[PDB]
Amino acid sequence: PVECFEPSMLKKKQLTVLDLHPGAGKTRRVLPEIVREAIKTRLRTVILAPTRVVAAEMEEALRGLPVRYMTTAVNVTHSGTEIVDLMCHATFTSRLLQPIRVPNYNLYIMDEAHFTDPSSIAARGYISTRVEMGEAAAIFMTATPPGTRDAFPDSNSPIMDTEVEVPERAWSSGFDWVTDHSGKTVWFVPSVRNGNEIAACLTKAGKRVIQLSRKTFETEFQKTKHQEWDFVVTTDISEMGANFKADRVIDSRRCLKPVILDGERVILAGPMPVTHASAAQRRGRIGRNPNKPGDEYLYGGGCAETDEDHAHWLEARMLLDNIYLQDGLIASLYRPEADKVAAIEGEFKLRTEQRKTFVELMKRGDLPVWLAYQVASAGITYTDRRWCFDGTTNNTIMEDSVPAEVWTRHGEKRVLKPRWMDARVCSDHAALKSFKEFAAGKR
Secondary structure, three states, X not given: OEOOOOHHHHOOOOEEEEOOOOOOOHHXXXXXXXXXXXXXXXXXXXXXXXXXXXXXXXXXXXXXXXOEEOOOOOOOOOOOOOOEEEEEHHHHHHHHHOOOOOOOOOEEEEXXXXXXXXXXXXXXXXXXXXXXXXXXXXXXXXXXXXXXXXXXXXXXXXXXXXXXXXXXXXXXXXXXXXXXXXXXXXXXXOOHHXXXXXXXXXXXXXXXXXEEOOOOHHHHOOHHHHOOOOEEEEOOOOOOOOOOOOOEEEEOOEEEEEEEEOOOEEEEEEEEEOOHHHHXXXXXXXXXXXXXXXXXXXXXXXXXXXXXXXXXXXXXXXXXXXXXXXXXXXXXXXXXXHHHOOOOOOOOOOOHHHHHHHHHHHOOXXXXXXXXXXXXXXXXXXXXXXXXXOOOHHHOOEEOOEEOEEEOOOOOEEEOOOOOOEHHHOOOHHHHHHHHHHHOOOO
8 A cells, every 4th residue: 555646646557545544634635636636637537535524624625626526515616627526435336326427537536445335335346346447547545445454553643542441331330531531532332322321321420422323424523513522422433524623532342233144134233343444443533633642542342354244245246236337247346345245246236127216215215225125126116115014023123112113105004014124224213213204105
């Protein structure tokens, strides 16, 4: 990997991983360098941001430079120059799945290129394949290249690393060091539910707590920038543009993991150890200010690279199987991620109509990729919600120890019992609320 940009990297067949460390100016100094060169040489380019938060942050760094922002996160104006596009990872992949026309970009710049969202993994597969075919160049920007075993990379400022016992439940004693802290803390929890319990405990202790999840991030991250807080309790938002003014990170280093069981359902297993890259990214929230040496990283266990049981690898394959490159050719996953999934090439390729349903189930439907695939491949149309109720008895969804029920579109009260069970649609209150509305045909 490389830690500084050279115009050499923009030539076709070049894939460069710009690794570096949190706050070294990736988006602030290096990204405008690349974009300026791309515009000067009239190189058709797309910039890929992990989130809309990052996209807006990029706009600030790229002001003055002609960029077509293809996101609602940025106020766009006319136009003239058509060289560099900017959009989110998910938008990029979604559009490749849709009939709409995506430019054959000759340069791909992916920010936070370790992001393990299925759309991001798929995007890297597409991009790396295009580079290998000699049709483009690519720059992957990330502090943690896929496959890294370094949980403690360099930082702008000295970091105090300490392994401790980290609570994952409410506590009455034994963890004074948590609350005996006058600074600001970012706390990475194993799940939203766990975060709720920890937040309530901290609030009871008189702390101001903001909670974030992967699904509330885009709208609620801004609270961390605009209101007073002592703790940010969050799931892994490390690479979503999570820049905080903090002096401490508490890291359980554990995560719930969606796992496909017997190829018929998805459970949430664990919590299990996070990867070295994940731990490095979480730790990377601090040690950013050279005027403030001695930020603390307190972690609660070890790391592991055995994450092949995570569903996002196969879900990436499901996405990539439905992206067209050229006749009979299906893109491979990015090489460092290629060994993560056992699959038959093209086995998830859907015909035109089913692919449209697949896309709408993921977008408007807001269903997990695996679940959306089951429904779409079954030949079910988007608004046909009968599958939400005709599952087997062990697929019954529970709400407060009692079978969940919804008022269906057909004016009938039915037990929530999906034909395919994916634990991610009912992992927490917000998720279950969303799925019940889906089952009722409200979207």
